Design a protein around this nucleic acid. Structure first.
Ligand SMILES: Nc1ncnc2c1ncn2[C@@H]1O[C@H](COP(=O)(O)OP(=O)(O)OP(=O)(O)O)[C@@H](O)[C@H]1O
Ligand SMILES: Nc1ncnc2c1ncn2[C@@H]1O[C@H](COP(=O)(O)OP(=O)(O)OP(=O)(O)O)[C@@H](O)[C@H]1O
Ligand SMILES: [Mg+2]
Ligand SMILES: [Mg+2]
Lengths: 106, 434, 485
DNA sequence: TTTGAAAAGCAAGCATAAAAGATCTAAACATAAAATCTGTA
C-alpha cells in the first residue's frame, strides 16, 4: 500500500512520527466526506503534494524561479568562482564573464 | 467548520491554512510557520483567510516595526490585552502595563495574569498571535525563536484563552535551523511569470482605470480601456521580466513610472491599434530608466587612484622626466604586461609621501618662478576633506590618528567616477592603464 | 518628564547605609556588645508545605534501607582532632586564626567541620571555653559574592546594611573594638572558590581580618583544591592563609564499608513483619522475613568507588540504587503498589554500577536513520581521505552523492536512491541535498555528536566530530549496509 | 657603430607585519527606591 511506502520512506529518512503526523493532519482535514477520506488514505497523493511543497523553496526550487538574465548572471558568477582558488568573485568579474558569454553566444 | 477562500494561485496554501487554523484549540497546533520570499502572497493569503472567517480572533504584529526583542515582548503584552478588552467588554480586568515586561519570563507571568481573569468564559478559545516577518527583526539571533517555540509550555494548560503563534518567515536557511522542532510549515514558492502577469492585471487594471492622466487625455484629444491597460501591463512584463525577475513590487514600480508617458502617446488613431501605440511608445520599453571638487582635490583623487592601482616599483619608469648631472638610470618598466585588469579588484594601500610625489608629478605647472607645486596648507586641507567625504579611506575607521606613519591610505571611488573626474579636468588617466 | 528608558521592576531591600564606626561617638563609648539584645543572634516558612495524607502508603522492606542510605564519623578522626585542637586553642586564648581545609567532593569536609563546631558548642555550654558565635557562609548560595559581607554582619550585629557599609562595619568591628567588649566568632567559608572575584578583595578582607590583633575571629576555609591560593590568589592572601593546610583524602574501601554498615546497623540481618497482602513491612497473611545486604556486594561497591573517587555520596547512592533495583524486581512479582529472605546481593550492585558506565552513544548512532548514518559514514571517509579532523559540508554533500552513485549495484541503494533524491514521487525534481539533510544535521548537532562553525555559507562551513572516531566507526560497522560498501 | 657589464626585472620559498574581526570591558549616560540630611516649625 501507498501508506506503508510513505511510512518506509519516513523510516529511512526522518524516522520521526511528528514529521509523519504533520503530513497526515492536512490529509485528514482537507477531506470533505467519508469516501474522499478513504480515497485519500488509500492513495496518499496528498502526501506527495505535501512533500513537493516542503521542498519548493530549497536551492533546487529557487533556481527554477529564475529569469534568463538571472540564470545567466548566476552561471557567470559560478564560472568565475570555479576558476578562482578562494572561490571568491565580485560584480565586475561576473559581468566580464557574462558579456564574454553573451558575445560568444551571439 | 471553517471557510476556505479562493486565492488565485495559492489554493494549496489556503487549504493548508484551513487544515491548521480553527477555533477549536484541541485540533490547532501551538506553532505554525508560513515561509516564502518577498511578494509570494503570504500576507495576502493570510489576510484573505482571516477575512473569510470573522469568528477567528487574530492579533497582527509587524516584527520589522519593533526592531528588537524587548519591544516585541511589550508589543505582544499590549496588543493581546487590548484585543481581549475589545473582544469581551463586560469582563472586568486589571490593566497591566506592557512596559513591565522586560524579560521573557515576565511575558509569561504577564500573560498568565491576563489570562486568569477570562476564566468565566464558556468555551475554550483560540487567540492567534501573528508575527508577520519574524526573521525581519534587525536585531535577530539564533536563540530568539526557541523562546517563542517553547512559550506555550509555560502558560496554563486548562485556560480558556490559549495563545497560538503564526510566524511568517523569509529565509529558507533560518527555517532550516529549527527543523528538528517539527513545526508545521506551509511554503509559498515564487510565482510564475504567467501568475505574475495575472496578478498584475487583476491588481493594477482598476488602478489604471481612474488615473486622471488617461481620462484627461481622452477628454483633451469600458472594455477597451481594460484592453489598453492589460496590453500595457503585458508589454511591461515582456519588456522587463529579465530585469525584475518574478518581483511583483519591481514591476509595480515600473508600471507606475511608465504609465503616464505611455498615456501621453494615445491618440484617436492609436486607441484601436495597439501595435501603432507600441511603435509610438517604444523608447520606454527599451531602457528601464529607474534612476534619480576643486582643481587640487580632483588631482589628489587621480593620484590616489594611480597609487592604489599601480605598483610603486614602476613609479620611476613613468613620471621621471628630469635631466641628470650625476650618472644614473631610471626604471626600465614592466618587461611583460599582466592580464588581470587590476581595476577589477580591491585597491592597494599607500603612504602619504608617495601620494604627494605622484600628485606633484602630474599636476600642471624664470629663476624664482617655482615651477613645481609644493604640498602647502591647501593640499593637506584638501586631502583631509577627501577623507571627510569618504572618497579616501584608511584601514582604521574609528579613533584614527592621521599623523602616524603606520596609517595607510586607499582610494574608494569606482573606475567610472574617477574617469568622470579625470575627463572633467581633461586628464588622460586611461593612458596609464594601457 | 519624558524618560529615555524605564525600570519598572526595581525591587530594593530596606538596608541602611551608615556603618558601625559612626554608631557611637567614640571608641570608649562602645558598650559591651555581648550584653546587647540584637548582637550575636539573641524558620517562618515551615508550615507552608503541609497537607493531609488521606491515604496509608505502602512501605516495603527495601524502603527503610533506601531511607537509611540517604546523605541526609568512623573514618575522620585525625582531621577532626586537628581542626578541633586549632579552633579550641583559638577560642580559649582570644586569638584570631585561619584553618584551611581542602578536598575532592563528598569526602566529609562539611560534615567534619559541622561536628567540630557542634562539639565546641557543647564545650562552651559547660563553660570549658568562652561562648562564641557560629556563622556559615556558603559561596555558592550567594546571589552576589559581596552578599557574604551583608550576611556575616547581619549575623553579628542584627543590622541590615548594604554590602560596602557592612564591610566597613566589619572592618571597624574586627580592628578597633576591644577584646573585652567582644565575642569570638567562628566563620565557616564553604566553597571558597566561589568567593573568588576579579579583584580578590573579599578573600583579602576575610583573611586579613584574621591577622588583626583585636578581631577574635576564626575562619575555617573549605576549598576544592590544595593549591587554590597558589593558582588563583595573590601572594599576600596566600601568605595570610598559611602554609599549614589540611587535606581530606578520598576514602579507602574499608572506610566506605564502615560508612555503609554504619548506615545499615539496625536493619541489616533483621526480621520484618511483611504483610504480603499489601507488602507494607513493619520492623520488629503476615510473614517474618529476614532482610540482608551481601557483605561482598558492599565490598565490590566500596572497592569500585574507592578506586574511582572515594566519594561517600557515590557509594551510598550505588547501594541505594541496588536496593531500588531489588525493590523493583520484588514489587514486579507481587504487584504491591504504592497506595522468606530478600537480599540485595552482588548482581544488583553490579547492575547499579554498570548502568552509570555503559555508553548510550554507540547505541544512539546504531538506531539512527539511514541518512544520518550515511552522513556519519561520509564524514569518516573524508576524515580518512584528506586527514583533516574538520570537513566542509559541501565536501560531505559531494561524498554522499559519490557514495550513492558509485555503489549503484547495491540492492538497497537501488531501492533508496529515488527516496533519497526525489522522495519517491516522480513529481518532485531531483534535489541537491538528500531528503532530511537539514534534519539529520540538526539532530546530530542537538545530540552533541557534531560541532558546526558559525558561517552563513553552507558549502564552506566546516563540521567536526565531537565524539571519538573509534566509537563512530564501531557504530558504523554494526549496520548491514554501510559495512558492506 | 658596437659591446660587455652593471642596473634593473621576475620567481620560489618563507618569515613576518597588518588587516579584519571576535570578544570583552570601562566609562559616559540614564533611572530609581531607600536612606539620609536639612530646615524651618
Ligand atoms: N494570489 C494573489 N492574488 C492577487 N493579488 C495578489 C496575490 N499575491 C499577491 N498579490 C498582490 O501582491 C501584493 C504583494 O503580496 P504580499 O504582500 O502578500 O507578499 P508577501 O509574500 O507577504 O511579501 P513580503 O515578504 O514582502 O511581506 C499583495 O498585497 C497583493 O496586492
Ligand atoms: N565519614 C563519614 N561518615 C559518614 N557519612 C559520611 C562521611 N563522609 C561523608 N559522609 C556522607 O556523605 C555526605 C557528603 O559529605 P560532605 O557534605 O561533608 O562532603 P564535602 O567533603 O563537603 O563535599 P563537597 O565538596 O561536595 O561539598 C555527608 O552528608 C554524609 O551523608
Ligand atoms: Mg508581508
Ligand atoms: Mg561540602
Amino acid at each position: 500500500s501507498n501508506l506503508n511506502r510513505h511510512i518506509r520512506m519516513n523510516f529511512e529518512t526522518f524516522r520521526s512520527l511528528p514529521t509523519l503526523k504533520n503530513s497526515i493532519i492536512p490529509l485528514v482535514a482537507t477531506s470533505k466526506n467519508f469516501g474522499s477520506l478513504c480515497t485519500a488514505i488509500k492513495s496518499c497523493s496528498f502526501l506527495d503534494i505535501y512533500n513537493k511543497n516542503q521542498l519548493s523553496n530549497n536551492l533546487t526550487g529557487r533556481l527554477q524561479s529564475l529569469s534568463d538574465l538571472e540564470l545567466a548572471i548566476l552561471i557567470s558568477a559560478a564560472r568565475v568562482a570555479l576558476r578562482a582558488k578562494d572561490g571568491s568573485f565580485n560584480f565586475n568579474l561576473a559581468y566580464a564573464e557574462y558579456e564574454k558569454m553573451i558575445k560568444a553566444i551571439n | 467548520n471553517v471557510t476556505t477562500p479562493e486565492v488565485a494561485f495559492r489554493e494549496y496554501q489556503t487549504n493548508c491554512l484551513a487544515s491548521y487554523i480553527s477555533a477549536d484549540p484541541d485540533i490547532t497546533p501551538s506553532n505554525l510557520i508560513l515561509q516564502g520570499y518577498s511578494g509570494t502572497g503570504k500576507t495576502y493569503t493570510l489576510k484573505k483567510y482571516f477575512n473569510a472567517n470573522p469568528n477567528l480572533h487574530a492579533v497582527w504584529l509587524e516584527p520589522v516595526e519593533l526592531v528588537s526583542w524587548k519591544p516585541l515582548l511589550q508589543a505582544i503584552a499590549r496588543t493581546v490585552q487590548y484585543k481581549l478588552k475589545t473582544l469581551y467588554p463586560n469582563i472586568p480586568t486589571t490593566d497591566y502595563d506592557p512596559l513591565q515586561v522586560e524579560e521573557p519570563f515576565l511575558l509569561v507571568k504577564t500573560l498568565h495574569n491576563i489570562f486568569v481573569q477570562y476564566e468565566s468564559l464558556q468555551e475554550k478559545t483560540c487567540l492567534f498571535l501573528i508575527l508577520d516577518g519574524f526573521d525581519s527583526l534587525q536585531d535577530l539571533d539564533a536563540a530568539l525563536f526557541n523562546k517563542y517555540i517553547k512559550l506555550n509550555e509555560l502558560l496554563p494548560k486548562d485556560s480558556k484563552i490559549n495563545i497560538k503563534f503564526i510566524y511568517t518567515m523569509l529565509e529558507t536557511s533560518f527555517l532550516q535551523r529549527y527543523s528538528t522542532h517539527c513545526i508545521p510549515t506551509v511554503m509559498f514558492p515564487r510565482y510564475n511569470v504567467d501568475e505574475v502577469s495575472t496578478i498584475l492585471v487583476m491588481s493594477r487594471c482598476g488602478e489604471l482605470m481612474e488615473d486622471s492622466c488617461l481620462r484627461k487625455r481622452i477628454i483633451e484629444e469600458d472594455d477597451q480601456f481594460q484592453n489598453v491597460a492589460a496590453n500595457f501591463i503585458h508589454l511591461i512584463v515582456q519588456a522587463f521580466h529579465s530585469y525584475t525577475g518574478n518581483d511583483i513590487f519591481a514591476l509595480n514600480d515600473l508600471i507606475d513610472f511608465k504609465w503616464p508617458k505611455y498615456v501621453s502617446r494615445i491618440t484617436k488613431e492609436n486607441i484601436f491599434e495597439p501595435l501603432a501605440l507600441y511603435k509610438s511608445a517604444i523608447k520606454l520599453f527599451l531602457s528601464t530608466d529607474d534612476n534619480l571638487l576643486s582643481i587640487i582635490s580632483k588631482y589628489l583623487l587621480i593620484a590616489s587612484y594611480i597609487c592604489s592601482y599601480l605598483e610603486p616599483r614602476y613609479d620611476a619608469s613613468i613620471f621621471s622626466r628630469k635631466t641628470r648631472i650625476i650618472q644614473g638610470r631610471a626604471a626600465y618598466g614592466r618587461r611583460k604586461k599582466k592580464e588581470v585588469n587590476p581595476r577589477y579588484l580591491q585597491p592597494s594601500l599607500f603612504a602619504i609621501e608617495r601620494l604627494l610625489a605622484i600628485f606633484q608629478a602630474i599636476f600642471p605647472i624664470a629663476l624664482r618662478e617655482e615651477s613645481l607645486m609644493k604640498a602647502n596648507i591647501e593640499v593637506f586641507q584638501n586631502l583631509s576633506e577627501l577623507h571627510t567625504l569618504k572618497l579616501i579611506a584608511t584601514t582604521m575607521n574609528k579613533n584614527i590618528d592621521y599623523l602616524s606613519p603606520k596609517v595607510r591610505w586607499k582610494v574608494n571611488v569606482p573606475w567610472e567616477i574617477i574617469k568622470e573626474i579625470s575627463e572633467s579636468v581633461h586628464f588622460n588617466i586611461s593612458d596609464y592603464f594601457s | 518628564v519624558i524618560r529615555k528608558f524605564t525600570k519598572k521592576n526595581v525591587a530594593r531591600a530596606k538596608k541602611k547605609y551608615t556603618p558601625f564606626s559612626k554608631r557611637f561617638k567614640s571608641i570608649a563609648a562602645i558598650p559591651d556588645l555581648t550584653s546587647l539584645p540584637e548582637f550575636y543572634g539573641n524558620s517562618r516558612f515551615e508550615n507552608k508545605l503541609k497537607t493531609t495524607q488521606k491515604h496509608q502508603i505502602v512501605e516495603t522492606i527495601f524502603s527503610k534501607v533506601k531511607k537509611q542510605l540517604n546523605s541526609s564519623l568512623p573514618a575522620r578522626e585525625n582531621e577532626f582532632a586537628s581542626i578541633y585542637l586549632s579552633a579550641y586553642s583559638a577560642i580559649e586564648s582570644d586569638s584570631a586564626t585561619t584553618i584551611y581545609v581542602a578536598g575532592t567532593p563528598g569526602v566529609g569536609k562539611t560534615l567534619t567541620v559541622r561536628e567540630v563546631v557542634k562539639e565546641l558548642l557543647s564545650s562552651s555550654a559547660q563553660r570549658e571555653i568562652p561562648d562564641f558565635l557560629y556563622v556559615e557562609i556558603n559561596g555558592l548560595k550567594m546571589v552576589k559574592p559581596t552578599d557574604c559581607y551583608e550576611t556575616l554582619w547581619n549575623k553579628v550585629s542584627g543590622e541590615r546594611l548594604t554590602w560596602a557599609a557592612s564591610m566597613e562595619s566589619l572592618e571597624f568591628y574586627f580592628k578597633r573594638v576591644p577584646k573585652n567588649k567582644k565575642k569570638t566568632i567562628v566563620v565557616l567559608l564553604d566553597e571558597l572558590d566561589a568567593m573568588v572575584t576579579k579583584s580578590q578583595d573579599i578573600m583579602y578582607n576575610f583573611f586579613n581580618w584574621t591577622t588583626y590583633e583585636n578581631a577574635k575571629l576564626i575562619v575555617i576555609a573549605v576549598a576544592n583544591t590544595m593549591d587554590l591560593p597558589e593558582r588563583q590568589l595573590g601572594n599576600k592572601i596566600t601568605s595570610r592563609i598559611g602554609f599549614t593546610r589540611i587535606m581530606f583524602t578520598g576514602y579507602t574501601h574499608e572506610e566506605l564499608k564502615n560508612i555503609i554498615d554504619l548506615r545499615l546497623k539496625g536493619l541489616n540481618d533483621s526480621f520484618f513483619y511483611v504483610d504480603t497482602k499489601t507488602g507494607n513491612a513493619i520492623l520488629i497473611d503476615v510473614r517474618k522475613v529476614r532482610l540482608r545486604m551481601s557483605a561482598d556486594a558492599i565490598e565490590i561497591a566500596s572497592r569500585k568507588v574507592a578506586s574511582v573517587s572515594g566519594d561517600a555520596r557515590r557509594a551510598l547512592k550505588v547501594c541505594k540504587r541496588a536496593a531500588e533495583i531489588a525493590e523493583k524486581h520484588y514489587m514486579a512479582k507481587h504487584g504491591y503498589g504504592y497506595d522468606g529472605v530478600q537480599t540485595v546481593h552482588i548482581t544488583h550492585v553490579m547492575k547499579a554500577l554498570n548502568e552509570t558506565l555503559n555508553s548510550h552513544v554507540i547505541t544512539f548512532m546504531t538506531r539512527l536513520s539511514f541518512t544520518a548514518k550515511l552522513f556519519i559514514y561520509a564524514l569518516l571517509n573524508l576524515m580518512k581521505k584528506n586527514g583533516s579532523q574538520e570537513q566542509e559540508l559541501g565536501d560531505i554533500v559531494d561524498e554522499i552523492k559519490l557514495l550513492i552513485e558509485v555503489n549503484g549495484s547495491n540492492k538497497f541503494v537501488m531501492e533508496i536512491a529515488k527516496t533519497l533524491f526525489q522522495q519517491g514521487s516522480d513529481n518532485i525534481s531531483e534535489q541537491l541535498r538528500i531528503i532530511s539533510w537539514d534534519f539529520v544535521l540538526n539532530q546530530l548537532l542537538d545530540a552533541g555528536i557534531l560541532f558546526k562553525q558559525t558561517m552563513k555559507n553552507d558549502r564552506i562551513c566546516c563540521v567536526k566530530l565531537n565524539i571519538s572516531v573509534e566509537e563512530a566507526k564501531r557504530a558504523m560497522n554494526e549496520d548491514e549496509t554501510l559495512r558492506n560498501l
